[PDB]
Design a protein around this ligand. Structure first.
Ligand SMILES: [Mg+2]
Ligand SMILES: [Mg+2]
Lengths: 454, 451
């Protein structure tokens, strides 16, 4: 969520800049005007209600000195404007009472507004997205305007089989009974594919590990209270699962890891802190209808990159590029062709300044499909989670919050499909060099077709 | 659930033995008698009704040949019986006699619709509560602590070492349980760094070991639909699992999804044994109520699931292979342990026998179970309807055995407590190959102990 001081010109903000961003994503720019308005009303109330406190006091102190010594009149010329220490000392105690009653009744009307405002403010702030990097293509149309930045390896080449067939032909896949047991799209992974996935996971962990990442195995479900801080409203509907306190099944490894450092002060010598998330992830995936394979599925393992960065100096954008670079070199090494894609503003979620997708070329399917997504969220989440930049070297008006980035480096199911269609040959699927050491004996070299293709 | 013919003496049964068993288990010996009664009442109704009918036809048959070939008294008394009314005695009784005898047979025909209800009532209710046959070796007691039999011991289970698994897990900087309780709830945890690596080593080592002994590794869904989770899982809906919303449950073992894999199938005898190494993350609510990774709500588990032939000793030989395979595993990891034969009182209804491998924790000064192996014979297979062969005469069911070979967090604790030293945790030889460089000799203590 954005700093409120950004919506206040007297605090150094530019409501105009945010109005304009709200336009670059495609969303209501008035959502800003309503926030400023409600914020201003909020702020005037705190001011006016402090005046009323003084007027009430003078009232109760004077009704104080008059009971140092029933009888009534309607008697009001007094608007609170005309009300003075002397003006009231000339009045019957019954009249000063009916005035103080008009004050405390106004002081309460403030508290009523303030309350309905504090919310109308927070409901609006939640729906206003983060500032965009200048490089983001401005469009609402994802397919036409996503912009291809780099290409690598041969993305033309066509091969014989789709990954749907190949998971059967090597007999690593039970989708019929998986569909009975867990519901639609449920699956079992058999044999070679289990050993293959373990190799991927090992190679990824080794990779990130030696680049400085700390492998971390997350809990798979989060408290509903911590979840609301790390995700958005369109998350709790589209894909998350409800569990019974009351908890949600994590859709990524970024959720628990963000909440890991919550309400804490990270020291600059310690940044950047890089984690390699290892988790099983669950997505309800509403909107994806259209039959089946292991590619789009409700349950899978991910290896995620999560980085805590300093706010200053562009160290977070430097880290951002370093993060997608790590992702590329991983797929480079496994010999998967891909192209990097800069996602349009309309398709970014609220916390993202910029998003890069690495999309692999699937030779069998003859399509690009997304293996990786990479985001810089700057301080948007950090400020909700209160993760503060912990500098000891000077004195500060307001604290600064760390930058947070997350990339999903490897989603085992999708990556496996990618490997399968790219390494597929005749006898079977060739095992990628970088994975051989991680396969069991007899499974290095090739993975044979044991069964015919549908 | 038991084969109904086991209750029927003339079907080869021994209802005494089943009673005796139910005694040995300490469950209710009565539930047998009830069902022998309801079963017999129905069958008696039925044999009467069927056999009383077989005579009514032989009444009409030889009554047919009578007027056709050639040739008025009361009913002769020496024919009314099942055994005394036979083809011959009908001839000497003429006809218009046979006619009247046939009216007495029809007066005695009854409907069993009333008795059937009662039988099915007993089956649906009681059958599920009569436990499986016991292996001769199962010690008979209801008190585990005193009467569990220790069959074997390996390595030195006396030895003490300085720190428990609770401290080592901190000292290696492998655990954030403070901040994992914030995120996931009570007992929630993060595993980090060296311990994420140790565990991937274990999973790799376990799967090589099972894979090269002929097991097919299988990665199951981590949740199943409420409907199917009911149709499969053992009486122990004891543990409260977890609920997901779709109406789904979070699995507590791989055993449930896999069992559900072969449900309602006929299995080629040629193919058996079918051996699976199940690999899944498991979720246990009720962790039992000072926080380690030993008792937690979520952990990875590698399980052995075997389908076997019902004939001869095959499943009991299989049972021994399985418990052995595990011992050898913990042996190669250099983990001291003893095998425990679990008493009759404590067995699940489906278990014929259960062996527990309990490793020794030097730091803690305690035995804690890393492995449990059970042979359920055809008990569950019969309910799941997983059939042996013949894809007519009496149907047979496969035997099913299952053992959890490695529960990663528990195993990891055993390794730490046993391999601890002054400098760090020595890496166990068979694991070295699977760890990253810098981790192959030793896992260092980078933090002071929580003292
Ligand atoms: Mg996607
Ligand atoms: Mg446990």
């Amino acid at each position: 969520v954005l700093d409120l001081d950004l919506f206040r010109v007297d605090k150094g903000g530019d409501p105009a800049l945010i109005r304009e961003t709200q336009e670059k994503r495609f969303k209501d720019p008035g959502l800003v005007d309503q926030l400023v308005k409600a914020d201003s009303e909020w702020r005037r109330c705190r001011f006016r209600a402090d005046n009323l406190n003084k007027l009430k006091n003078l009232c109760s102190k004077t009704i104080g000195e008059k009971m140092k010594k029933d009888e009534s009149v309607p008697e009001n010329v007094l608007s609170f404007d005309d009300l003075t220490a002397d003006a009231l000392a000339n009045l019957k105690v019954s009249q000063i009472k009916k005035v103080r009653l008009l004050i405390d009744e106004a002081i309460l009307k403030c508290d009523a507004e303030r309350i309905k405002l504090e919310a109308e403010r927070f409901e609006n702030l939640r729906e206003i997205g983060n500032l965009l990097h200048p490089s983001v293509p401005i469009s609402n149309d994802e397919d036409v305007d996503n912009k291809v930045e780099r290409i690598w390896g041969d993305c033309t080449v066509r091969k014989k089989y789709s990954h749907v067939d190949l998971v059967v032909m090597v007999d690593g896949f039970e989708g019929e009974k998986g569909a009975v047991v867990a519901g639609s799209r449920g699956y079992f992974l058999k044999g070679v594919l289990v050993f293959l996935e373990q190799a991927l996971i090992q190679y990824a962990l080794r990779t990130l590990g030696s680049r400085g990442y700390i492998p971390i195995y997350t809990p798979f479900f989060m408290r509903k209270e911590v979840m609301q801080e790390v995700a958005q409203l369109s998350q709790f509907d589209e894909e998350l699962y409800k569990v019974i306190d009351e908890k949600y099944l994590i859709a990524t490894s970024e959720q628990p890891i963000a909440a890991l450092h919550r309400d804490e002060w990270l020291r600059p010598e310690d940044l950047p802190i890089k984690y390699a998330g290892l988790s099983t992830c669950f997505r309800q995936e509403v909107g994806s209808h259209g039959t089946r394979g292991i590619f789009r599925v409700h349950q899978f393992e991910k290896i995620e990159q999560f980085v805590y960065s300093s706010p200053h100096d562009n160290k977070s954008w430097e880290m951002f590029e370093e993060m997608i670079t790590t992702a590329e070199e991983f797929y480079q090494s496994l010999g998967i062709p891909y192209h990097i894609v800069n996602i349009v503003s309309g398709s970014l979620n609220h916390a993202a300044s910029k998003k890069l997708d690495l999309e692999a070329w699937f030779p069998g399917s003859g399509a690009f499909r997304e293996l990786v997504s990479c985001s810089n969220c700057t301080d948007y989440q950090a400020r909700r989670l209160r993760i503060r930049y912990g500098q000891t070297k000077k004195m500060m008006d307001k604290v600064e919050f760390v930058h947070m980035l997350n990339a999903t480096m490897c989603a085992t199911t999708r990556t496996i499909c990618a490997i399968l269609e790219n390494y597929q040959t005749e006898k079977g699927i060739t095992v990628p060099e970088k994975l051989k050491e991680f396969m069991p004996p007899g499974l290095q070299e090739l993975i044979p077709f044991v069964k015919p293709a549908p």
